[PDB]
Structure formats: structure tokens, C-alpha cells
Amino acid sequence: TPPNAPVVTYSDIVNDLIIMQGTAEAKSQLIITDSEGNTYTLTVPDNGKWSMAIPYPSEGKFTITSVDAIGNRSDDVPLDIMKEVPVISLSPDSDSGTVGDNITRDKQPTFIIGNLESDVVVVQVDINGTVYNAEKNADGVWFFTPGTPLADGSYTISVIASDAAGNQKNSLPITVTIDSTLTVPEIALAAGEVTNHTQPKFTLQHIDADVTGVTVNVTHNGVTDIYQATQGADGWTFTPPAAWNDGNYTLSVTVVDRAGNSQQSASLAVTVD
Amino acid sequence: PPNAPVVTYSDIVNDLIIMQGTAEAKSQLIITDSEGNTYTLTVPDNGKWSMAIPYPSEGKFTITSVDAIGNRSDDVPLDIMKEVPVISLSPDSDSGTVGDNITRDKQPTFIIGNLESDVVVVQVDINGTVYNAEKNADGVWFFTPGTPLADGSYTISVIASDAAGNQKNSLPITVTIDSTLTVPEIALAAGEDNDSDNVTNHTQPKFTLQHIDADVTGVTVNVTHNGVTDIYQATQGADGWTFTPPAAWNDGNYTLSVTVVDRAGNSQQSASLAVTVDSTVTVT
Ligand SMILES: [Ca+2]
Ligand SMILES: [Ca+2]
Ligand SMILES: [Ca+2]
Ligand SMILES: [Ca+2]
Ligand SMILES: [Ca+2]
Ligand SMILES: [Ca+2]
Ligand SMILES: [Ca+2]
Structure with a gap:
């Protein structure tokens, strides 16, 4: 009679090694051959219990076999795991x-x-x-x-x-x-202001909550200047960082949200007196 | 109302769910689990958040963003497994x-x-x-x-x-x-039957025990003499599995079998062997 098929009682993968314990006929050869044609061979201890670790092979595929001292082999135990x-x-x-x-x-x-x-x-x-x-x-x-x-x-x-x-x-x-x-934004002068300030306040409305970029385009006498808005607790805000010439100024705000949507408000043509 | 928070990374390490994601900058991120625990954090100015919570029952929990005025995103319900x-x-x-x-x-x-x-x-x-x-x-x-x-x-x-x-x-x-499990056999050893009628003149004859499978873990010999059966532990020696009575047998009849038990707990008993010990010399 051939050896009985070897047994796996436990298996685990740690790092890139398969670790196993099991049982098999005491003193027989335990032959483990993998998908890459490596062979790993051990002698089963006298108690009929074995343990082994092998490099995890390609596709997790490998076979376990016992061979006794007179060259009789057990059934093959082919395994196919995944990592x-x-x-x-x-x-x-x-x-x-x-x-x-x-x-x-x-x-x-x-x-x-x-x-x-x-x-x-x-x-x-x-x-x-x-x-x-x-x-x-x-x-x-x-x-x-x-x-x-x-x-x-x-x-x-x-x-x-x-x-x-x-x-x-x-x-x-x-x-x-x-x-x-993304909602189309809006530039308007703040509540209490044609204006007498050379640094007038602007309220910026309909600015969606996901908006992360806000700029004010100020366009006057053929030149356009682009300003960074100020985000506050109440929302986004803009007052020119420096004094502004007497005259007519065209304005708009451009918003960009975190997704990179962009909207530009309607034009606002104003007057600093 | 804020946009739903986003999970860019999740992992389970040592019974904690670890996560990274994106969410409305400066908002509150609320994580509520299936056991009724709530965990909250302030989302940083770059919109990037990270968190670790204890793995809740069934891997179930939801993530929700809420701004300063208490407007609330959709809930993001998750159901994972560990x-x-x-x-x-x-x-x-x-x-x-x-x-x-x-x-x-x-x-x-x-x-x-x-x-x-x-x-x-x-x-x-x-x-x-x-x-x-x-x-x-x-x-x-x-x-x-x-x-x-x-x-x-x-x-x-x-x-x-x-x-x-x-x-x-x-x-x-x-x-x-x-x-x-193969059925074993017991026989008098080579020169013990002294011609082939299982009469021996040895008072402690040697028996050979054959057809024992390699997965056998227990070998015993049953000896029945005078209506009584005794069980002896067999020996594995030079010539294979063996048995010899511990004490000399009186003249007369003995009936033997060998029992084998394999590692799986299968058991077989051999056919009975009848032997006669005759060490008594006839006087004339
Ligand atoms: Ca596989
Ligand atoms: Ca948006
Ligand atoms: Ca993106
Ligand atoms: Ca689950
Ligand atoms: Ca068996
Ligand atoms: Ca004889
Ligand atoms: Ca068992």
C-alpha cells in the first residue's frame, strides 16, 4: 500500500512565504514542487508531524507528495491559493x-x-x-x-x-x-455704497460651497487686472488692495471649484467718484 | 449643502479602520457607526482629511460633511468586512x-x-x-x-x-x-516449528507478525490459553514485527492472533493460529 496522502492542518501567508503545518507518514520524504518547477524536500519527523515555509510561487500553485523509503508515492495533493x-x-x-x-x-x-x-x-x-x-x-x-x-x-x-x-x-x-x-457667481458693491470710495467693498454672491478659487477681474481703459478674493466666515469678499483712479470700471468674478469647473459672473460697469 | 466627502484610501490595521480622503475645507466630518458611536473632526484648509476609528460591528458606518451653518452633505454609507x-x-x-x-x-x-x-x-x-x-x-x-x-x-x-x-x-x-487496513498474519518464526504442524518444543517460541501496513501505530498479540485471553505488546525487531511470550509456556495448546491499529483508528485482527508446546520428553 502507498503512503496515505499528506495532510495540511494549517496554512498561512506571511510576507511572501507560504507557511504550513500538517501530518504525513513519519520518516517519509515530503516533496513540494511548485508552478515554477522549484522542489522543496524534507524528511517527515518521527512524530508524523511536519512544518515548512516556501517562497510564495507564481499563481499560488504547488503540489505536495509523500514518498516512503522504498520509492512508493502517495496521491498528489495539488493546491492553488491566492495572495x-x-x-x-x-x-x-x-x-x-x-x-x-x-x-x-x-x-x-x-x-x-x-x-x-x-x-x-x-x-x-x-x-x-x-x-x-x-x-x-x-x-x-x-x-x-x-x-x-x-x-x-x-x-x-x-x-x-x-x-x-x-x-x-x-x-x-x-x-x-x-x-x-457650479453656480454662476455675482459681483455687487457692498450694502452701504456710483461710489465715493477709491477702495469700494464688493459682495460676491452665489458662490457654491465647494468653490476653492475666487478671483475678481477688474477691467479699465483697455487693461485687465486680476485680484485674489478674500474668503471669510460670512463668505468671499473683495476690496482693492490700493487706491483707485477716478473713472469707470468694468468688473466680473470668476469662480473655480475643487473639481475644476469654472463660471464667470455677468459684467458690472461701475463709477468711482 | 456641501458635496459628499470622498474616501481616497482605506485600510484595516490592528482592529482600526484607517482612512484618508477629501472634503469641504474647514467643514466638520462626522463618522457614525452601526453601534451608535459618533466621531468628528475638523477638515483642514487644504481639504485633505485623515482618520482612524475602531472597527465597528459588521464594518458598517457612514461619513457626512456638515458646514458651519449646519448644512449637511449626502451621507456616504460604507459596509466593509474584516x-x-x-x-x-x-x-x-x-x-x-x-x-x-x-x-x-x-x-x-x-x-x-x-x-x-x-x-x-x-x-x-x-x-x-x-x-x-x-x-x-x-x-x-x-x-x-x-x-x-x-x-x-x-x-x-x-x-x-x-x-x-x-x-x-x-x-x-x-x-x-x-x-x-490490511489484515495481518501471525506465524511461528523460521526454525520454531520443530516439522510444519505448529508443534514446537520451545517454551517461549518466536512468532513473526506479517502484513502490517506502514501507518500502523499499534501492534498487539492475543494469547488464549485455558479459556483466558491475554494481550501482549509486540516488538519491532531486526527481522520485522515480532513476539515471544514474557514467561515460559506450560506444555499444551495456545491460540494466537495479532491485532493491528492504524493512525486513523482502523483495526484488523489476523486469523487464529493454534500452536502446541511440547517440551516434554517421553520416557521409556
Ligand atoms: Ca491561484
Ligand atoms: Ca461643483
Ligand atoms: Ca480631481
Ligand atoms: Ca460588513
Ligand atoms: Ca490505513
Ligand atoms: Ca513441529
Ligand atoms: Ca485522526
Whole structure:
């Protein structure tokens, strides 16, 4: 009779080593051969218990076999595990305004998928609870691009990958905000002011809460000067940093939100007396 | 009303959820978990936030942005998962030595644990075929093969998934099913039968014990004399497994068998061997 098939009682992956304990016929050879054709061989101790660590091999694939002292071999115990949790992120090419903040005005952004083992056969994306096939590009790299443009709002995204043996892992969620929406702003003189001040105050209204850039365009006698607004508790504000010539001044405000939407207010043609 | 906060990074380290994201600068970020805990932070001027909370029950929690005047974003509800399920051979299905995952039980029960309370699907993969796990009276999950397993090796992985479709499966363990043991044999050793009628003149004759499998862990010899059976521990010597009575036998008849027990707890007994000790010299 051949040795009985060797047994794994415990397995774990730490770093890039597979660690196992198990049992097998005492004093037999335990032969572990992996997908890359490495062989790792040990003599099973006298108690019939063994332990081993091997470098995690390509695709997590390997076989365990026992051979006794007279050359009889057990059944092969072929295993196929998986190690890598897939990763997904917003493509920097679909990421408007600041890059890396997961906010974009792009309504069909691409997501880039990484950290897949070469035996992965199913790759999918969960977007707000609905699961879709990911797609494989020319270079064998996976991605996902929505088929139709997404409405504005928040999308929780997780990537799911599984190999032929049914090992499946999904990423811890990230989210993305699609924002292509911004209110047209407004420049008006402040409440208590044609004006007598050479540094008149301006109230800036209809400035959306997600707005991070605010400038005032002051246009007079063929030259345009661009001013940084002041954000305060009450909102955004502007008074010219220095005294202003007598005459007529044309004004507008331009807002840019964190997504990189931009709006310009209507023209305001005024008079410093 | 602010735009929904954004999560750019999340990770679980040492029972804490770690996160980074984006949110309305200077706003309050409110994190509320499934256990009713609230955690709040002031979002920095660059709009970049980071936080760590204790992993709450079921990995459920929501993130919400609220500005100075108390206008509130949409809630961002998250439902994650942490625990990889565990599966082991039930001790009641583990015959012979306990804990070696070798058993003669053809339908052994496996016990499942390390499941969070929002788990909705639990399954077992046995040699590549995936089955429903079942939940017993005590609410604990288990799996028992529906038909008898043939001797050999079974790779076992448990799979569990919650309602948000988070799914994790265990790194494999295996069991070897072994219900097979050769029937041993006992015989008088080479020159003991002194011609071939199992009469010996030795008072402590030597017996050879043959057809003992390599996974045998127990070898005993039954000696029945005068309606009484005694059990002796066998010896593994130069010539293989062996036995010789500790004390000299009186003249007459003895009936022997050898019993073997393998590591899986299978047991076989040989055919009976009848021997006659005749050391008495006829006088004339
Ligand atoms: Ca694999
Ligand atoms: Ca961006
Ligand atoms: Ca906006
Ligand atoms: Ca959960
Ligand atoms: Ca056992
Ligand atoms: Ca056996
Ligand atoms: Ca004889």
C-alpha cells in the first residue's frame, strides 16, 4: 500500500512565504514542487508531524507528495491559493482639477486596476452595490470605464478578482465624487455704497460651497487686472488692495471649484467718484 | 449643502479602520457607526482629511460633511468586512489521534467560525466543488458531506460573504480519509516449528507478525490459553514485527492472533493460529 496522502492542518501567508503545518507518514520524504518547477524536500519527523515555509510561487500553485523509503508515492495533493488583494484607483487622465483627490468633473472616468496575479480569470467592479465586468486592455491590464455618463454625486468603488480555483478577494472601498455643476457667481458693491470710495467693498454672491478659487477681474481703459478674493466666515469678499483712479470700471468674478469647473459672473460697469 | 466627502484610501490595521480622503475645507466630518458611536473632526484648509476609528460591528458606518451653518452633505454609507472565515475538522469526526486531520469517518463534519454577524452566504469548497454550509440549532455553521467520501485527500476552504458582497475564503487545509487496513498474519518464526504442524518444543517460541501496513501505530498479540485471553505488546525487531511470550509456556495448546491499529483508528485482527508446546520428553 502507498503512503496515505499528506495532510495540511494549517496554512498561512506571511510576507511572501507560504507557511504550513500538517501530518504525513513519519520518516517519509515530503516533496513540494511548485508552478515554477522549484522542489522543496524534507524528511517527515518521527512524530508524523511536519512544518515548512516556501517562497510564495507564481499563481499560488504547488503540489505536495509523500514518498516512503522504498520509492512508493502517495496521491498528489495539488493546491492553488491566492495572495494579492486587487487595487483600483481613478486614472490621473480622468481626474480634473487637483489630481489624487478622487474628485472629477469627467462623467465617464476610467478606473485603473492593479495587483492581480497572472491566473486571475474573473475581474469585476462594484459601483454603488452593482457589479460589472471589468475590461482588459491591449497590454493585459484591467480597467473599468462606465458605459454611460454618471450623474453627479458619490460612487463607492471596490474591485473584485478571482482565480480558476475560486479564490476571490475584493478591495476595501474608496469613493469618487463626480461634480460638473457650479453656480454662476455675482459681483455687487457692498450694502452701504456710483461710489465715493477709491477702495469700494464688493459682495460676491452665489458662490457654491465647494468653490476653492475666487478671483475678481477688474477691467479699465483697455487693461485687465486680476485680484485674489478674500474668503471669510460670512463668505468671499473683495476690496482693492490700493487706491483707485477716478473713472469707470468694468468688473466680473470668476469662480473655480475643487473639481475644476469654472463660471464667470455677468459684467458690472461701475463709477468711482 | 456641501458635496459628499470622498474616501481616497482605506485600510484595516490592528482592529482600526484607517482612512484618508477629501472634503469641504474647514467643514466638520462626522463618522457614525452601526453601534451608535459618533466621531468628528475638523477638515483642514487644504481639504485633505485623515482618520482612524475602531472597527465597528459588521464594518458598517457612514461619513457626512456638515458646514458651519449646519448644512449637511449626502451621507456616504460604507459596509466593509474584516474577518476571513475559519474551518476545522470536528473532534467528534476525527478518529484515532485527534488533531492530525486524518480520519476513517467517510462523512466527517467540519465546524466553521470567525464570521461577522452580517454574513448572509456561507459555503464550503471541497476539492473544487462549492456547497452550501448549514447552520445548526445553536446557530453555529458546519458542513457534512452528503454522501460517503472515498479514501484519499480533500482540500477544504470556507467562503463567507456579507450583504454588500464582501467575500473572503480561508487558506486551504486538507483531510485524509483512510478506512483501509490490511489484515495481518501471525506465524511461528523460521526454525520454531520443530516439522510444519505448529508443534514446537520451545517454551517461549518466536512468532513473526506479517502484513502490517506502514501507518500502523499499534501492534498487539492475543494469547488464549485455558479459556483466558491475554494481550501482549509486540516488538519491532531486526527481522520485522515480532513476539515471544514474557514467561515460559506450560506444555499444551495456545491460540494466537495479532491485532493491528492504524493512525486513523482502523483495526484488523489476523486469523487464529493454534500452536502446541511440547517440551516434554517421553520416557521409556
Ligand atoms: Ca491561484
Ligand atoms: Ca480631481
Ligand atoms: Ca461643483
Ligand atoms: Ca460588513
Ligand atoms: Ca485522526
Ligand atoms: Ca490505513
Ligand atoms: Ca513441529
